[PDB]
């Protein structure tokens, strides 16, 4: 069921992310290639989560953030995106707005661990 | 029910039996030891030890695969060291052999060829005579003989400067596994045994290789021990572990000399001859006394096995290739099989005659020869006799057998069992979000 | 020490969690033979983090959780269990049952998510 | 940017921290020798997350403990620390003060996790 | 003993090979095909 939500809409799709997220980790020549993949495999991984470490999404399949929606990026209404949208269809409306996006995000969280500790040593 | 919720583990002190790859390991301390030369990370004097209180485990060394990880590993590292230096493969050629008689004892008679034949040294159609001597058994007849496995496999020099002299090689668990250990004498090798403790590395074992009678290696806590898959079964060998050793010395009592012999461009073979003084037999003179103990230990615990009313004996095993019939060590750099008759004669010091070779057929493989080079000068060695590998044929007959490598191996690891760890699991408990 | 624990009971062994848990990380053919060793050692570590993740258990060595005992997984005491076994007894005890349970927390985990999603869309 | 913070103060340099903590992870004997440099980078990047985990720092770049500075590590007074002194000469400061710190931040998360499963057990 | 379509097919072809560096050929003859042969009798 690996790609079964594919032709879903967004709002329906997204219950199937555990099942997206998790079927990711599953002596010559072809001993090396297999291990590049291997590796390979083990880097994207990797990137994936301390991303969203750096975010503060870490341990979350969904995570709310602080940083607002910016227009330019999309001006449709949420509900022609969650209702009549595919996550595919969407990916490709903003596919052009990626660093655009995390950069804030790692601001925000920097900001916001900043502010915890300036609390936690009162 | 009791409303006790899932509650989730991790680092949850728990196994499972597995088999992967164990790394070799040694001590800080032989420039050319393929053994050393194997790197093998020193390893931490400091055992683990870890006792465990109430395990219990069970194991079967009839089964380990640490034994199989064992003769693989030897196989790999001793072909490796083979790609380089010298293939002899112009040796191939007819020769002219003599009896070599002018500084013999008798019983030598009939051991030496002179061999003279035509190799180069350029391509140049520009041959020279060249003589060696060699020992019969390497020699066949076509006055005109070939080497014996020109006919059957390539031929290896093995190259002078790489020494096989065995320093014990301790194995190491890999990140994830570790290696269990019986402590229990009385052990039989198999089944479970309480006094489980931890291993991050085995005892250093020395990767002796041996026909017959086990060599080296280690000594039976506190009686001989008798091993067996399948003791009734006339089919299986018999592993026996003596608690403590025969004192075995053997020796090539022959001054020799080491002839370079040009045979191509940076190429040199190693020819060998005019050997200085009286020739004479090799030989090994196990101290008597202790092997008669020795027997009468072994016996008595055979009895144990087949009944204390019976009588057995010990014949001189069977016939076959020398590979089979005869005992055989390397000790000195030289390959030497001694007749064991004279050891395994009895029924319920000690002169033993050898033969020595130079075209060697690893017992691992054929469609290869190795051709050990002469060691120069003469050969003692002295060695601890630590087991015995036998077989069976009212009274029993038993004779000695092996010829499989990994016997030599099995022996030793028969206490050491490979697991996994599977740190992760639930119970019910108290524990609500 | 890193078996120690191993003949201890499961109500005592449970305080030895992190040295279990820590000591997991610790040019021919045997190049290509410690290598493969060194990516499985990873792979293996990572697919029990990623359970842990899922399964909202991420970041501790015991975590608790909504999805309650179902009876026939085991009848016995807690007491009986937490006294009077090991980890390695119990674990042969319920050897199968596995996927029976995990199934039930990754459930369990996505709709606590969806839950505080709906909350903090609020 | 990545050492940009190099000659900062401890107090100035501690804002950066994304770059440095996230730029860590970016067919014969040249491929044997690359693997094993993306080999070793795996690993020591999960090493250093497997600590955090331990010590109760997951998925933050600054965590606060409950383990006390014990005086003789330094007795530098705190703005002396923090205002004239680089990470790098703090390091080299108090770099024979290692073990001796990480072996008691493990004990206290330990400590705590079981005091918030008795309490959640209620 | 051919059909007359493969009158063309095969050739004899005798030759020199050894077994032994001594400088001691034998004669072996194999049969080919003709596409695997080409003349330099
Ligand atoms: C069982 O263990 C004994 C003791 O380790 C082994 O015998 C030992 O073999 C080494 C290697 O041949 C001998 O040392 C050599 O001495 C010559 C002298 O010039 C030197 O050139 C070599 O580099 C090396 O140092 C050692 O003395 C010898 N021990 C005794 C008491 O003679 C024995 O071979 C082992 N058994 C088997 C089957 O290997
Ligand atoms: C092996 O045969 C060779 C060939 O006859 C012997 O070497 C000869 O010994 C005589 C003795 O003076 C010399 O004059 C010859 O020149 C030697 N031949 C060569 C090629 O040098 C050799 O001694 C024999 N080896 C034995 C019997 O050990
Ligand atoms: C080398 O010595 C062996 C014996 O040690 C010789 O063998 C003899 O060969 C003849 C050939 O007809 C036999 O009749 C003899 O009976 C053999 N002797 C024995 C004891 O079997 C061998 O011929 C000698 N080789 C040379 C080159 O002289
Ligand atoms: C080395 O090569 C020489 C030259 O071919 C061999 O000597 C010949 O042997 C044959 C054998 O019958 C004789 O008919 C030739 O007359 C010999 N030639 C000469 C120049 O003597 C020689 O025997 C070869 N060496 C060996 C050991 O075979
Ligand atoms: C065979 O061994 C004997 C004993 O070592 C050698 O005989 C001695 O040779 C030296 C050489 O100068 C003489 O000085 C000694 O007097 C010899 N001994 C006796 C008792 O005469 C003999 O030469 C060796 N033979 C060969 C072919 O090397
Ligand atoms: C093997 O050789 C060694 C010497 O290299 C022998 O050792 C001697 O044994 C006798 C026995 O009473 C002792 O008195 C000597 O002191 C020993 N020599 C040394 C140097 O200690 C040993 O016995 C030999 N083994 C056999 C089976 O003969
Ligand atoms: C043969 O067995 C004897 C013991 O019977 C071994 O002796 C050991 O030698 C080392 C050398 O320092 C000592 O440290 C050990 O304590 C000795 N053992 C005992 C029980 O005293 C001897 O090394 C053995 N030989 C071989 C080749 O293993
Ligand atoms: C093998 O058969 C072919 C024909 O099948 C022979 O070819 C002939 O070669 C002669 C050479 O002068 C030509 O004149 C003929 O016209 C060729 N025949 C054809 C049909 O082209 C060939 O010579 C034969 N080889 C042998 C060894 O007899
Ligand atoms: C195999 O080798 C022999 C020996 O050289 C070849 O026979 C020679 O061929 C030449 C060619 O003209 C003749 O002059 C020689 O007199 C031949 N020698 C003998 C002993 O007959 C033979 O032809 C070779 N085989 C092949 C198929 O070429
Ligand atoms: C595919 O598109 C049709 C269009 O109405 C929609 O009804 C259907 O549910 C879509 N498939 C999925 C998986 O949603
Ligand atoms: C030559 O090799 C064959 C291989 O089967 C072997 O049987 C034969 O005995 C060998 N020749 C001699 C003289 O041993
Ligand atoms: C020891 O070997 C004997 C041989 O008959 C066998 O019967 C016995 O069960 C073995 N013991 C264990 C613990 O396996
Ligand atoms: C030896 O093997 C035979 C094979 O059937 C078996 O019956 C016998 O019991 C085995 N002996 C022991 C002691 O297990
Ligand atoms: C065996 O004992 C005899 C007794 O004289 C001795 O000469 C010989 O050298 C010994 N051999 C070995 C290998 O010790
Ligand atoms: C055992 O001794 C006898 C005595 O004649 C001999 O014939 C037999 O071949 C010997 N056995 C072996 C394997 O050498
Ligand atoms: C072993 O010694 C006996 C004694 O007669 C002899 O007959 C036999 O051939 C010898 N075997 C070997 C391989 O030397
Ligand atoms: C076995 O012992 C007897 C006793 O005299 C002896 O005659 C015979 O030769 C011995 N066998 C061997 C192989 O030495
Ligand atoms: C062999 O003979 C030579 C001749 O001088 C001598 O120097 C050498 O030491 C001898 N080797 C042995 C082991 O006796
Ligand atoms: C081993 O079992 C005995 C049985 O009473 C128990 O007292 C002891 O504490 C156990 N070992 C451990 C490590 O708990
Ligand atoms: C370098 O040292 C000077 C000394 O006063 C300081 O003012 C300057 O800010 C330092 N550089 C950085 C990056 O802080």
């Known amino acids: 069921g690996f790609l079964g939500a594919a032709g879903s809409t967004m709002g329906a799709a997204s219950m199937t992310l555990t099942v997206q997220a998790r079927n990711l980790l599953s002596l010559t020549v072809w001993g090396i290639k297999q291990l590049q993949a291997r590796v390979l495999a083990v880097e994207r991984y990797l990137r994936d989560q301390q991303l969203l470490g750096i975010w503060g999404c870490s341990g979350k399949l969904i995570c709310c953030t602080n940083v607002p929606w910016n227009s330019s990026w999309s001006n449709r209404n949420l509900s022609e995106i969650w209702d009549n949208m595919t996550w595919l269809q969407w990916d490709k409306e903003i596919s052009n707005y990626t660093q655009i996006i995390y950069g804030l995000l790692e601001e925000s969280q920097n900001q916001q661990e900043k502010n915890e500790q300036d609390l936690l040593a009162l | 029910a009791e409303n006790l919720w899932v509650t989730v583990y991790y680092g949850v002190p728990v196994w499972k039996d597995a088999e992967t790859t164990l790394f070799c390991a040694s001590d ?208 299986k060998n018999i592993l026996v572990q003596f608690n403590t050793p025969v004192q075995i010395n053997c020796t090539r009592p022959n001054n020799n000399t080491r002839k370079s012999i040009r045979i191509g461009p940076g190429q040199w073979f190693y020819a060998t001859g005019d050997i200085i003084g009286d020739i004479r037999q090799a030989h090994c003179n196990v101290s008597k006394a202790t092997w008669n103990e020795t027997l009468g230990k072994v016996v008595k615990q055979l009895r144990k096995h087949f009944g204390n009313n019976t009588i057995i004996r010990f014949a001189n095993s069977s016939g076959g290739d020398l590979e089979v019939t005869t005992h055989s060590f390397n000790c000195g750099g030289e390959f030497f099989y001694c007749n064991t008759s004279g050891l395994f004669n009895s029924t319920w010091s000690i002169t033993l005659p050898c033969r020595i070779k130079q075209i060697i057929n690893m017992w691992q493989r054929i469609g290869q020869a190795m051709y050990a080079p002469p060691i120069q000068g003469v050969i003692r060695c002295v060695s601890n006799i630590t087991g015995l590998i036998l077989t069976r044929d009212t009274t029993e007959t038993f004779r000695p057998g092996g010829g499989d490598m990994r016997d030599n191996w099995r022996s030793e690891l028969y206490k050491y069992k490979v697991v996994k760890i599977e740190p992760l699991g639930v119970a019910p408990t108290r524990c609500k979000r």
Chains 1, 3, 4 share one sequence.
Not at chain 2, 195 to 201: M, P
């Open chain 2, 28 to 235: 800080a301390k032989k420039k050319h030891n393929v053994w050393a030369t194997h790197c093998c990370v020193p390893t931490d004097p400091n055992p683990q030890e870890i006792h465990l209180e109430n395990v219990t485990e069970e194991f079967n060394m009839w089964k380990n695969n640490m034994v199989e990880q064992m003769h693989t590993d030897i196989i790999s590292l001793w072909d490796q060291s083979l790609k380089p230096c010298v293939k002899l493969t112009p040796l191939c050629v007819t020769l002219q052999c003599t009896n070599v008689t002018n500084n013999i004892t008798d019983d030598m008679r009939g051991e030496l060829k002179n061999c003279s034949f035509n190799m180069t040294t350029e391509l140049r159609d520009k041959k020279q005579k060249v003589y060696s001597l060699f020992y019969r058994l390497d020699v066949v007849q076509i006055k005109e003989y070939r080497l014996i496995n020109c006919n059957t496999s390539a031929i290896t020099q093995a190259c002078p400067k790489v020494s096989f002299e065995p320093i014990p090689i301790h194995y190491c668990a890999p990140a994830g596994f570790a290696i269990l250990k019986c402590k229990d004498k009385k052990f039989n090798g198999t089944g479970p045994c309480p006094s489980v403790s931890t291993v991050q590395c085995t005892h250093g074992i020395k990767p002796v290789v041996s026909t017959q009678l086990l060599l080296n290696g280690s000594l039976a806590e506190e009686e001989v021990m008798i091993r067996s898959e399948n003791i009734t079964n006339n089919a």
